[PDB]
Ligand binder design. Sequence first.
Ligand SMILES: *[C@@H]1O[C@H](CO)[C@@H](O[C@@H]2O[C@H](CO)[C@@H](O)[C@H](O)[C@H]2NC(C)=O)[C@H](O)[C@H]1NC(C)=O
Ligand SMILES: *[C@@H]1O[C@H](CO)[C@@H](O[C@@H]2O[C@H](CO)[C@@H](O)[C@H](O)[C@H]2NC(C)=O)[C@H](O)[C@H]1NC(C)=O
Ligand SMILES: *[C@@H]1O[C@H](CO)[C@@H](O[C@@H]2O[C@H](CO)[C@@H](O)[C@H](O)[C@H]2NC(C)=O)[C@H](O)[C@H]1NC(C)=O
Ligand SMILES: *[C@@H]1O[C@H](CO)[C@@H](O)[C@H](O)[C@H]1NC(C)=O
Ligand SMILES: *[C@@H]1O[C@H](CO)[C@@H](O)[C@H](O)[C@H]1NC(C)=O
Ligand SMILES: *[C@@H]1O[C@H](CO)[C@@H](O)[C@H](O)[C@H]1NC(C)=O
Ligand SMILES: *[C@@H]1O[C@H](CO)[C@@H](O)[C@H](O)[C@H]1NC(C)=O
Ligand SMILES: *[C@@H]1O[C@H](CO)[C@@H](O)[C@H](O)[C@H]1NC(C)=O
Ligand SMILES: *[C@@H]1O[C@H](CO)[C@@H](O)[C@H](O)[C@H]1NC(C)=O
Ligand SMILES: *[C@@H]1O[C@H](CO)[C@@H](O)[C@H](O)[C@H]1NC(C)=O
Ligand SMILES: *[C@@H]1O[C@H](CO)[C@@H](O)[C@H](O)[C@H]1NC(C)=O
Ligand SMILES: *[C@@H]1O[C@H](CO)[C@@H](O)[C@H](O)[C@H]1NC(C)=O
Ligand SMILES: *[C@@H]1O[C@H](CO)[C@@H](O)[C@H](O)[C@H]1NC(C)=O
Ligand SMILES: *[C@@H]1O[C@H](CO)[C@@H](O)[C@H](O)[C@H]1NC(C)=O
Ligand SMILES: *[C@@H]1O[C@H](CO)[C@@H](O)[C@H](O)[C@H]1NC(C)=O
Lengths: 347, 439, 199, 99
Amino acid sequence: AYTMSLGAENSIAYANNSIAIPTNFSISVTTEVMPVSMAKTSVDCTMYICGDSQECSNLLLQYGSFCTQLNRALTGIAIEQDKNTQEVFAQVKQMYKTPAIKDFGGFNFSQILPDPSKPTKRSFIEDLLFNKVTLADAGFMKQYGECLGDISARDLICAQKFNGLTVLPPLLTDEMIAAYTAALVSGTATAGWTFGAGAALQIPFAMQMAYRFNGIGVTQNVLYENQKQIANQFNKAISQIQESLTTTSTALGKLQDVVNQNAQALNTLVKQLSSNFGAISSVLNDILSRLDKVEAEVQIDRLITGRLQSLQTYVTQQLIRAAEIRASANLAATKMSECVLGQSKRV
Amino acid sequence: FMLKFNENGTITDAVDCSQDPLSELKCTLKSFNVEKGIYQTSNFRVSPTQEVVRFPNITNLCPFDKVFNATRFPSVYAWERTKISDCVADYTVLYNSTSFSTFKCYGVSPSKLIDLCFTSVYADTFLIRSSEVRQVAPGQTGVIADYNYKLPDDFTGCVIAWNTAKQDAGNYYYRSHRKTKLKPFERDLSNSDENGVRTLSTYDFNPNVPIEYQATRVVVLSFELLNAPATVCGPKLSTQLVKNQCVNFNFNGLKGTGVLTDSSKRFQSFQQFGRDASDFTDSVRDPQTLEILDISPCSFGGVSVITPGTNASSEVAVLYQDVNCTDVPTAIHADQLTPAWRVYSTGVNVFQTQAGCLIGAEHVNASYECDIPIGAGICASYHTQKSIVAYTMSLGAENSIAYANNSIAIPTNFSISVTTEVMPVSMAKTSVDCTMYIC
Amino acid sequence: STALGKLQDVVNQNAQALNTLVKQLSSNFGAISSVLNDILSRLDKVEAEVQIDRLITGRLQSLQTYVTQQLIRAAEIRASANLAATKMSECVLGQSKRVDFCGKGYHLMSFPQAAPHGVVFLHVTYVPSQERNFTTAPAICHEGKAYFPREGVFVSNGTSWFITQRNFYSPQIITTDNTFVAGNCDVVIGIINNTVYDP
Amino acid sequence: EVVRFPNITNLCPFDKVFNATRFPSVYAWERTKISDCVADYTVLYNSTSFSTFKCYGVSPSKLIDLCFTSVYADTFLIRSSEVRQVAPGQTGVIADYNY
Ligand SMILES: *[C@@H]1O[C@H](CO)[C@@H](O[C@@H]2O[C@H](CO)[C@@H](O)[C@H](O)[C@H]2NC(C)=O)[C@H](O)[C@H]1NC(C)=O
Ligand SMILES: *[C@@H]1O[C@H](CO)[C@@H](O[C@@H]2O[C@H](CO)[C@@H](O)[C@H](O)[C@H]2NC(C)=O)[C@H](O)[C@H]1NC(C)=O
Ligand SMILES: *[C@@H]1O[C@H](CO)[C@@H](O[C@@H]2O[C@H](CO)[C@@H](O)[C@H](O)[C@H]2NC(C)=O)[C@H](O)[C@H]1NC(C)=O
Ligand SMILES: *[C@@H]1O[C@H](CO)[C@@H](O)[C@H](O)[C@H]1NC(C)=O
Ligand SMILES: *[C@@H]1O[C@H](CO)[C@@H](O)[C@H](O)[C@H]1NC(C)=O
Ligand SMILES: *[C@@H]1O[C@H](CO)[C@@H](O)[C@H](O)[C@H]1NC(C)=O
Ligand SMILES: *[C@@H]1O[C@H](CO)[C@@H](O)[C@H](O)[C@H]1NC(C)=O
Ligand SMILES: *[C@@H]1O[C@H](CO)[C@@H](O)[C@H](O)[C@H]1NC(C)=O
Ligand SMILES: *[C@@H]1O[C@H](CO)[C@@H](O)[C@H](O)[C@H]1NC(C)=O
Ligand SMILES: *[C@@H]1O[C@H](CO)[C@@H](O)[C@H](O)[C@H]1NC(C)=O
Ligand SMILES: *[C@@H]1O[C@H](CO)[C@@H](O)[C@H](O)[C@H]1NC(C)=O
Ligand SMILES: *[C@@H]1O[C@H](CO)[C@@H](O)[C@H](O)[C@H]1NC(C)=O
Ligand SMILES: *[C@@H]1O[C@H](CO)[C@@H](O)[C@H](O)[C@H]1NC(C)=O
Ligand SMILES: *[C@@H]1O[C@H](CO)[C@@H](O)[C@H](O)[C@H]1NC(C)=O
Ligand SMILES: *[C@@H]1O[C@H](CO)[C@@H](O)[C@H](O)[C@H]1NC(C)=O
């Protein structure tokens, strides 16, 4: 046990007549990871609560619109996940095809553009990102026959499907997302910022970087006078991204934990069906087998209200988490416009 | 059915919710008119029409005569326990011969006894005066409950008693005092104390005594309903199996509904049913063949109905989520469906989307802007006659930039643009009088 | 009609939430009746209170649901109101360099207009149009030393080299006023030879 | 378990309350206060069997280890048919017009 270090100890050699001027520079490439969407969860509220039984379903009608109101909430979450994706990507709906030459002024975009030798039209970097996040529960999409196996084939995802819990697929497939990012990097490589304001105007890439140096307040000559250095520093920095993404799993933790949180929530929701909630049994057919309506209904009501309470908890948690994902998607959409479609003075 | 009631309270419209996918949509949305969209739809397609009842073929009738009509019962201090096993509990044979002034059951309804099966039964028997049968219940107190025969709080079973003042004349004993109460189903046969005088009081039973003092026989049946072989069953006859259909079933008194199939499951030698982490009973041992059947939900898998507005058309399309188009007629139990739904099982206008099989929308190779979002790149629209068409959505216009290392495009003109951005700032300031709403 | 859909759906969502809350009073929640006086008329307190408790708990649960949805929706409206307040400061009370913040194109102005439960911004933007291809060079070499554009870019109309501002073609004579000189012209890749006029 | 109870020791007057020479007519039911005594009701097990023993707000099995801040005993004679009317929420000639 120890006290935290707040930071490195440092001092500034202040004097009323002294200044430090940088004599050199480093081109730095930095990775920012942002969540944009979450799993479009869906619930058959009758199948979850009453588990395919008429007696319970006829009791559940006496609770009114609770189920309809929960489904209305979750479909609101689901539609919002597609909105989030189409607000971050799809800001530019000119599908600028990837240029045939991936080197501009010495800057080697080949790792961040698609490669036509591969079967999947991702960039090389995007292939690393799609490998480095894992859908640790095998990621839903359980095929029609797959839940009818031996004992060892039992699976919380089959327990989910049998109890009415499902994940809808996103509207944009990954090939469509990769097509937008390919178009966005292609416009930046060949038309700079202009295609964010209007029609894309081609400009030579070094000449575009020279304007970007002026935006920083480094004189235009300092680019051309060092263009091979600057391009090499850029190329090496991109390679360091590729090396870190191939080696290191923690980089995308902000996305893996969105997967983990939503997987865990669905797992607790199915497991809550094993609770009695003070009924004689957690099992609905066991009550209906063993008790007659005059007193079964008292036991069923304990299950209905407890199960129904467990759904309302889950939907509230999803509404909370969805608001956080929306805020991240709104921020990511702002960074697309301001960092990709332009140059930002915002420190 | 969903029924629309007029202000005069006459029915003016109705939807048969099982009829077709539009009817299921209307019933799912609790509404007779539906806006354009795609909606998750609750299963009204299928309901069980059959019972699959299967019970062990044990045929020996339970020993009601030997247990109830024994020549004499025990003194309550010396109550006797017997195991009842491998028999059919057709208790209706008694209706001809006795009437019980108490028949009271715990954890089981008495009307259910005729179609349950029990993994264990023990009958306890003793004689007490009629006023004391009151005390033979969980949580009771009194000379019987304290010092002669205690039921547990977790008791499941039935207490049965009848007057026998004509039969059970004589002397019978009960413990009036003890230094500590009995534990549940404890017995204490000690007659003499340390010095030799008896610790037991005597019932004097005669038909001449007042009713409250007259002898009643009591039988206490204690039950178990474990995940173990059935030992006593009600008289139910067994039916044939009906696999691959949504049915009601009853295996050893475990009722339910679902789809039965063969299964790969290894059960334990004693095990009668299996449950997943949700306690959903996913398998059962057939008591007739000892084969293990899988139980699937009748409603299993997601279904969604795609519609223009019902103001626009009564045409719909159905998405069978994660189902392959050749499996739809079996994932949906299309043999059990109406003809109007079975149209949406098969035929032309089936299209395998990565979201699932889409049926009833014709696939079109022209891409358009997304109208109704089906998923995984597919959208649908009500499109020119009109029909529901399904297509891959267009991401944007095809374009290319004429890049060269020495070419630049400069704007020669400009447009002043005025753009409208609409932003919500407020919502209605709702308020609730919580007492007026609730009470 | 669709232009204000973002306002109409705030109205619609809040109307629908109140309508479902009144309709929820029609539920029994497993009581013998949804109607409170019907229970109290028909049952004695010893056992009416068991039925009344089922109504109280289910009704109170329905309020807790409604209030939770309102807290969620109010957090969303607050984020929209904070963003609208930021656009008032940055797009109305100034001019914003933030690329897509005050509408598409380069922001000139915007005007706020009141709307029910909302604001409408009329964003005014310059959109460049009718672009034309030009040959261009990073620098001019005049007398062994490299001249760079002071602002804009060097372009030629085929015959002649000019300096123009980048967002509107207005060619100027390349003058020691329009340009700064920095270093010998060997280093600049793509350097070209042209006169620089000296007034 | 730390069990601590007041050290009152006088046994409650079960014989005088229950085995009185006669009970009141139900219209003239009599109330008596019971106080400063130990309610070891098991002394009755030897001598009297009760065809009704029904408790409200307390389980009868818990009577042996509770203490009460007041006790009153109401006593009256009725026909056995009518004892069902001696309960909360009952009706009938007793519940309406006698007790
Ligand atoms: C900034 O520092 C780098 C070294 O980190 C300098 O790069 C070296 O430059 C000399 C002469 O140009 C070469 O001989 C070395 O091989 C270079 N090394 C590397 C790693 O590039 C660079 O010149 C410095 N920049 C400026 C403007 O002086
Ligand atoms: C751009 O970067 C790549 C390195 O990623 C350069 O080298 C090629 O890299 C791929 C793997 O990424 C190999 O399969 C090729 O064989 C490599 N080619 C060579 C010649 O080494 C690529 O050359 C770079 N482009 C430019 C124009 O420098
Ligand atoms: C920009 O384009 C507009 C047309 O879109 C030009 O305006 C036209 O100019 C001619 C001659 O002056 C008129 O006859 C037309 O009526 C004008 N059109 C409109 C809509 O007013 C304008 O001259 C161009 N600007 C520049 C700087 O070239
Ligand atoms: C559905 O089709 C895919 C091939 O497109 C196949 O991999 C999968 O196993 C099929 N599902 C079933 C249940 O046969
Ligand atoms: C209700 O009944 C009255 C009288 O029969 C009739 O005039 C009125 O039109 C009815 N209302 C509706 C909505 O049909
Ligand atoms: C019912 O009792 C009659 C005589 O009282 C007897 O003949 C008959 O066999 C009895 N039936 C059963 C089922 O015990
Ligand atoms: C009990 O058994 C005796 C002897 O067989 C018989 O006479 C009597 O009728 C039986 N009682 C009942 C209720 O069956
Ligand atoms: C009775 O049970 C046995 C064992 O479970 C089985 O072999 C037999 O087929 C069943 N039915 C008949 C009619 O024998
Ligand atoms: C759409 O294009 C595919 C090409 O793979 C073709 O097979 C199919 O017949 C086309 N559909 C129509 C309706 O023309
Ligand atoms: C610029 O040149 C390319 C090829 O010469 C051409 O495709 C493009 O349309 C030109 N742009 C303009 C604005 O004329
Ligand atoms: C280029 O512009 C100059 C204007 O000073 C003009 O004299 C020359 O002819 C132009 N050339 C072409 C090809 O337009
Ligand atoms: C531009 O490209 C041409 C070949 O297309 C080449 O000859 C020339 O040296 C290049 N110049 C620059 C500045 O990239
Ligand atoms: C520019 O001028 C210098 C000196 O006159 C000459 O050496 C060089 O080759 C020229 N460049 C071109 C491209 O003509
Ligand atoms: C009531 O008191 C009388 C007189 O002492 C006694 O004979 C009788 O047995 C008592 N009753 C009971 C039930 O103890
Ligand atoms: C119990 O009854 C006996 C007589 O049967 C009597 O002698 C004894 O005192 C009684 N005990 C109590 C505690 O009343």
